Design a binder for this molecule. Sequence first.
Ligand SMILES: CC(C)=CCC/C(C)=C/CC/C(C)=C/CC/C(C)=C/CC/C(C)=C/CC/C(C)=C/CC/C(C)=C/CC/C(C)=C/CC/C(C)=C/CC1=C(C)C(=O)c2ccccc2C1=O
Ligand SMILES: CC(C)=CCC/C(C)=C/CC/C(C)=C/CC/C(C)=C/CC/C(C)=C\CC/C(C)=C/CC/C(C)=C/CC/C(C)=C/CC/C(C)=C/CC1=C(C)C(=O)c2ccccc2C1=O
Ligand SMILES: CC(C)=CCC/C(C)=C\CC/C(C)=C/CC/C(C)=C/CC/C(C)=C/CC/C(C)=C/CC/C(C)=C/CC/C(C)=C/CC/C(C)=C\CC1=C(C)C(=O)c2ccccc2C1=O
Ligand SMILES: CCCCCCCC/C=C\CCCCCCCC(=O)OC[C@H](COP(=O)(O)OCCN)OC(=O)CCCCCCCCCCCCCCC
Ligand code: HEM
Ligand code: HEM
Lengths: 535, 535
Amino acid sequence: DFAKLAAAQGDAIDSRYHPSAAVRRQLNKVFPTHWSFLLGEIALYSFIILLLTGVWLTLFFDPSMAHVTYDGVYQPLRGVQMSRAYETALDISFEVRGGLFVRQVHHWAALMFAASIMVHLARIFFTGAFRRPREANWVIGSLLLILAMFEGFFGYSLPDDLLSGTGIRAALSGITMGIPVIGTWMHWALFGGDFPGEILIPRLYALHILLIPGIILALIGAHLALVWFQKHTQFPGPGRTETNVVGVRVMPVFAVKSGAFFAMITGVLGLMGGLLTINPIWNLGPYKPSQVSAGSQPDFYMMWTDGLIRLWPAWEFYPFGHTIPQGVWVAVGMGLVFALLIAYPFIEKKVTGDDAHHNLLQRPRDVPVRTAIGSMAIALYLLLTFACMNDIIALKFHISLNATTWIGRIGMVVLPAIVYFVAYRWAISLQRSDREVLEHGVETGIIKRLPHGAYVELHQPLGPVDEHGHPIPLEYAGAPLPKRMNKLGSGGAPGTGSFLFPDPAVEHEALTEAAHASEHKSLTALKEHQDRIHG
Amino acid sequence: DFAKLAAAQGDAIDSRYHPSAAVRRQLNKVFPTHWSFLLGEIALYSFIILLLTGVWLTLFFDPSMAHVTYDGVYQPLRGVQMSRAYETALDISFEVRGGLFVRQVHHWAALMFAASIMVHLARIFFTGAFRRPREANWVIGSLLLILAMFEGFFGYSLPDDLLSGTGIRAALSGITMGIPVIGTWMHWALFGGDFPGEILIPRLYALHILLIPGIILALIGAHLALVWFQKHTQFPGPGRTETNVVGVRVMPVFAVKSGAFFAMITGVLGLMGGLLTINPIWNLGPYKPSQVSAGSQPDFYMMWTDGLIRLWPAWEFYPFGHTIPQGVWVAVGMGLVFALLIAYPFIEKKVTGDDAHHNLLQRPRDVPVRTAIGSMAIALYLLLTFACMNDIIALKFHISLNATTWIGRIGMVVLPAIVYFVAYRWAISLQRSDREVLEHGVETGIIKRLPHGAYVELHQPLGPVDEHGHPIPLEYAGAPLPKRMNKLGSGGAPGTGSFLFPDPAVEHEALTEAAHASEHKSLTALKEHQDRIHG
Ligand SMILES: CC(C)=CCC/C(C)=C/CC/C(C)=C/CC/C(C)=C/CC/C(C)=C/CC/C(C)=C/CC/C(C)=C/CC/C(C)=C/CC/C(C)=C/CC1=C(C)C(=O)c2ccccc2C1=O
Ligand SMILES: CC(C)=CCC/C(C)=C/CC/C(C)=C/CC/C(C)=C/CC/C(C)=C\CC/C(C)=C/CC/C(C)=C/CC/C(C)=C/CC/C(C)=C/CC1=C(C)C(=O)c2ccccc2C1=O
Ligand SMILES: CC(C)=CCC/C(C)=C\CC/C(C)=C/CC/C(C)=C/CC/C(C)=C/CC/C(C)=C/CC/C(C)=C/CC/C(C)=C/CC/C(C)=C\CC1=C(C)C(=O)c2ccccc2C1=O
Ligand SMILES: CCCCCCCC/C=C\CCCCCCCC(=O)OC[C@H](COP(=O)(O)OCCN)OC(=O)CCCCCCCCCCCCCCC
Ligand code: HEM
Ligand code: HEM
C-alpha cells in the first residue's frame, strides 16, 4: 500500500517537524520558463558531475613529486623517471577499469563548467540581471568564475605532465617571480623553495580537492539561495511586471524539467568522455625542465591569460638595480580584468544613474551601450584566446607565427573597437526592426493591387486596425515581436495522425479543436491577468 | 559616522533583499540556558578548530608511500627509509614554523571532538532528548559520532608511522581480511592489493580531508538545522512547559555567550597543543612491518574497539575447508554496537510504548531503567577502553598482563551488571531524596526543643505551611530541588566593597537592595507566567 505508506510518512514528518508551510512555499515558488535561464543550471550540473567524478579520481590519485620508474603496463613509458602523481594518473588511465573514462568525463565536465559559467555570465550581463537587487549575486558569481578558472588550472596541473608542467612553470613560477616587491617571496612561499619544490603538487591537490571546491560550494550555495529568495528575474511579457513572477511552479513542471535537463547534461558529458579524447597525458611524458612541446597551451578558460602573455609587447622596466619583467604587465592586466568584472554593476550604476529596483530583464538590443561593451569584451577575450592558440593556428592554417602574433597585438586594440561599433549599431537596428514591426505589422507575401500595378507586401497588423487599412501602431513593451507569420496563427495544422499513416478524422478534429481551445484559453488567461494588473 | 553607515547598510540589505522578518525570527529565537546544552557546542567548536588546522596541515602534508631517505633536520632519523607521508609529517613538526604546534592542536582538537561528542551523547541519552521528536536527530548524530571515530582513525593513521601503521595493520587489514564471504575482497579493494599497497595513504588522505569531513559537515548542518527549527528541548521548571522555550534570545545574550564559549574552547585547545605533547611521530619511527612497540594503542575513541579485540576469547570457527578468524567476532560486535546506538530511540519507544511528542527533558534519576542502561553501557565502554590500555596499566600499575586481560574478560559481563544494578538503585534513591525534600523541606542545623531534650533538624519548608509546624507536601514536578539553604536566600550577602577594602555604606545598600529587587522581579515574573499558563 504505497499510498498508505506515503500518507503515514507525511504525517510522521509533519508531526516530528512542521515543514508543511515551508514545503508548500518551495513547491509553489514560480520560476520563469525562459531557456536562457537554464544556462546557470548547466554550470551547476557540470559542477555536480565534477564533484562526483573527482571523488572517484581522488580514490586512485597520489599527489607527489617522489621520483619513480613507471614499471606499469604502458610500454612507451617504461623505466622513465616520473613523479608519483604522473604514475598514478597513468594508473588511473590504464590500470583501473574505467579510470580513463572517469578522468576524461571529469576534464570534460571541467571544460563544460567553465564554458557554461561564461555563457551564464554573458546571459546575465547582456540581460541586465545584475542591477539593483542582484549586484551582490553578480559579485559572488564573478568570484565563482575566477575560482573555477584557477581550480581548472590546478586540476589539469595535478597530474605532473609535460604540458601542464611547462604551463605551470610559465604562468605560476614566472609571473610570480616577476611581481616587483614580493614576487620572489610569493614564489618561495607557494613552492616552498625553487620552482620544482617537492610540495607543489601536494599543495595543489589540497587546494583543488578540498579548499577551492569548498569555497566554490559555499559560494554556489549562496548563489542559489539568493536566486531562490530574490525571486528569479524575467523578461518583459504579457502578464510579467516588476512585482510578479510568471512561469511554472517548482513541483509539477520546473522540478521535472530541471531534473531531466540535469540527466541530459550528464549524458552529453558522458558521451564526450567516451567519444572525445581529453588530455591524453600518456602521450605527454613526465614533466622535465628540459623537455618541451610546440603546443604548450592551457585549457580554454586560461587561454585568454596565456594569450595576454603572448601578445603583450615585451615591455620591461629596470629601476635602480632592479627589474620589472613582462610578467608583471600580465599580472596587472588580470587584476584589472577581474576588478572590472567584479565591479561592473557598480560601475554601470555610477555611469548611468540607475538605482531603481529592477526585476524585468532588458533585451540586449534594448540596452545598446551595454550590449556593445559586452560584445567588445567578448571580442577581446576571443582575440586573446586565439592568440594563445596562435601557435596551432599558424601551424594548421598557414599563417606566419609572427603574423599571428602581430595580428593579435593590433587587433586587441582594433577588433574591440570594430566590434563595439558594429554591436552598438546592430542593437539600434534591431530596435528599429522591432519598431517597424510595431508600426506596420508582420511581413508576408506580395500582392499586386487590382486597379493599378502597385505591389504591397500584405502585412499583418499586431494590434487594432484603424478604420482604413493602416493599423494603429502599438507601444513597445520590452518583449520580442513575432516577425514571421510562421510563429503566429498561420500554417500550423498538419494532419495529426502519425509520420507514416493518418488517424481517424473524428480523432484529428477532436484533437485539433482541443488544442485550439487550450491555446486560446492560455492567451485569454494571460490577457485577463495583464488587464487586471492595471485595469 | 558608524551609526549612519550601519543604518545605510541595513537599508541597503533590506532593499536588495527583504530579510527583516527572518532575521528578527532568528534574533528572537529563545534558547534554554542550561550548561549541559553547551556540550554539543563544544563538539561543534572543536570541529571548527579541526577544519582550520586541517587546512594548514594539508598545505604541508604529502600523502604517499614513495620511499625516501629523510635527509632532513631531525638527526635521530637520518638516512632511514621512510614514506613521503612520514617525511612530510616530520617536516611539519620540525622544518615548518609552528607546524608542530598546529599538528598538536589538530590532534588535541580531534580528541576533544570525540570526547565532547561522547559527552553530548551521554547528555541527550540520559535526559531523553531523542524520543518522539529529535529521534532522527539522534540517528544522524550517531552516524556523526561513527564518522568522527573513523575520521580520527584515518587522521592519526595519515602520517605513516610505526604506531599508527601497526594499528592499521591490526584493524584495517586483519579485521577486513578475516570477514568470511568477502573479507579478502574488501581488503584488496581498500588497499589496492596486499596490505602495504602503494595507495592506502593517498586513499585515506582523500577520505580524511574531503570525503568523510564533507559528510560530517553536511550532517552537522542537518543536525544544527534540526536543533534550530525543532526548538531546543528544556528541563522541567517554573515557567517551562512542553509548548514553550524558556531561556534567552539569540541576539543579546545567547550569541555573545556562545562566541565567548567558542573562544574559551579554542583557548583550551591551544593551551593543550602547546603545553602537552601529542603523537610524537619523530619518536615513533617510520612504519616497517618488522618493527613494533609495546603500547600499540589507538586513540581513546577507537580504544574500545581495540579492547574488544583484546578481550574476546580467541574463538575461531573452521567450516568446510575455510576459516572464520576472531576478527569477525569484533567486527560483528562493532556492527551490533553501532546498530543499537543508532536504533535506541526506536527500541526504547517499542519497549516502553511512549510515542508522545516530548519537549520537556526528564532528569536521569526520573528514568531509572534508562539511566541504568546508560550507566551499564558506559561501564562496558570504560572496561573496553581500559582493556585496550591493559598493557600500560599492567606495566605501571603492577598487575600481571594475563590478570588484566582476564579482569577485562570477566568484567565485561560482570561490571555492566553491577553498574546497572547500582545505577538503577542510585536513581531510585535520588528520587526518594527528592520526595523527602518535597515532603519535609530542606535540612538545616539541629535545635534542642525547650521543654524536653528532643532534637529536631529545624527544616525549612519549600511550600505553604500547614496551620501547625509540618508543611503541606508538594508534588514532584520533574525539576531539581534545593537541598541546601546555602543555595536559597540564606547567608548570601557579603560586604560588596572589594576583596581588600570596603565600599561606602550607601553604595553597598543601594547595590544589595537593587539586587534583591531584581531577584524578586525575576521570581515574580516566572511565577506569574507559570500561573497564566496553568490558569
Ligand atoms: C590572434 C589571431 C586571431 C591571429 C590571426 C590568426 C587567425 C585565426 C587567422 C584566421 C584563420 C583562418 C580563418 C584561415 C583561413 C584562411 C583565411 C584567413 C581566409 C580569409 C578569412 C575570411 C574573412 C573568410 C571569409 C569567410 C569566413 C568567415 C571564413 C572562416 C573560415 C573558418 C576557419 C571558420 C572557423 C573558424 C576556426 C575554427 C578557426 C581556427 C580556430 C581554432 C582555434 C581551431 C582549433 C582546432 C585545431 C587547430 C585542430 O587542429 C583540430 C583538429 C581536430 C579536431 C578539432 C580541431 C580544433 O578545434
Ligand atoms: C554510552 C551510552 C550513554 C549508551 C546508551 C545505551 C546504548 C544506546 C548503547 C548502544 C551500543 C552499546 C552496545 C554500547 C556499550 C559500549 C559502548 C558505549 C560502545 C560505544 C562506545 C562509544 C562510541 C561511545 C560511548 C561514549 C560515552 C558516553 C562515554 C562516557 C563519557 C562521559 C559522559 C564521561 C563523564 C564526563 C566527564 C566529566 C569526564 C572526565 C572524567 C573522566 C576522566 C572519566 C573517565 C574516562 C573516560 C570516560 C574515557 O573515555 C577515557 C579514555 C581514555 C583514557 C582515559 C579515560 C577516562 O579516564
Ligand atoms: C600557529 C597557528 C597556525 C596557530 C593558529 C591555529 C589554527 C590553525 C587555527 C585556530 C586560529 C583561530 C582563527 C582561532 C579563533 C577561532 C574563532 C573564530 C574564535 C571565535 C571566538 C571569539 C574570538 C569570540 C570573541 C568574544 C565575542 C565578542 C563573542 C561574541 C561575537 C562572536 C565572535 C560570535 C560568534 C558566534 C559563533 C560561534 C558562530 C558559529 C557559527 C556556526 C558554525 C554555527 C552557529 C550555531 C551555534 C554556535 C550553536 O551553538 C547552535 C546550537 C543549536 C542549533 C544551532 C546552532 C548554530 O547554528
Ligand atoms: C550495554 C547494554 C547493551 C546495550 C543496551 C541498549 C539496547 C536497548 C536496551 C534494552 C532493550 C531490552 C528492554 C527490555 C525488554 C522488555 C521485554 C518484555 O518482557 O516486554 C515488556 C515490554 C513492556 O510492556 P508493558 O506493557 O509495560 O508490560 C510490563 C510487563 N512487565 O513489552 C513491550 O512492549 C516490548 C516487547 C519487545 C521489546 C523488544 C526490545 C528489543 C528489540 C531488539 C533490539 C536488541 C536488544 C538488545 C538487548 C541488549
Ligand atoms: C569544482 C570544479 C572542478 C574543476 C573545474 C576541476 C578541473 C579538473 C581538471 C580539468 C582536471 C584534469 C583531469 C585530467 O587531466 O584528466 C582535474 C583533475 C583532478 N580533479 Fe578536479 N576539478 C574540479 C573539482 C574537483 C573535485 C571536487 C575533486 C575531488 C572531489 C577533484 C579531483 C581531481 C583529481 C584527483 C584530479 C587528478 C586526476 C588526474 O590527474 O587524472 N576535482 N580537475
Ligand atoms: C572532522 C574531524 C577530524 C578529525 C577527528 C581529525 C583528526 C585527525 C587526527 C587525530 C590527526 C593526527 C594528527 C597528528 O597525528 O599529528 C589528523 C591529521 C590530519 N588531518 Fe584531520 N581530522 C579531522 C578533520 C580534518 C580536516 C577537515 C582536514 C582538512 C581540512 C584534516 C586534515 C588533516 C591532515 C592533512 C592531517 C595530517 C597531519 C599530520 O600527518 O600530522 N583533518 N586528523
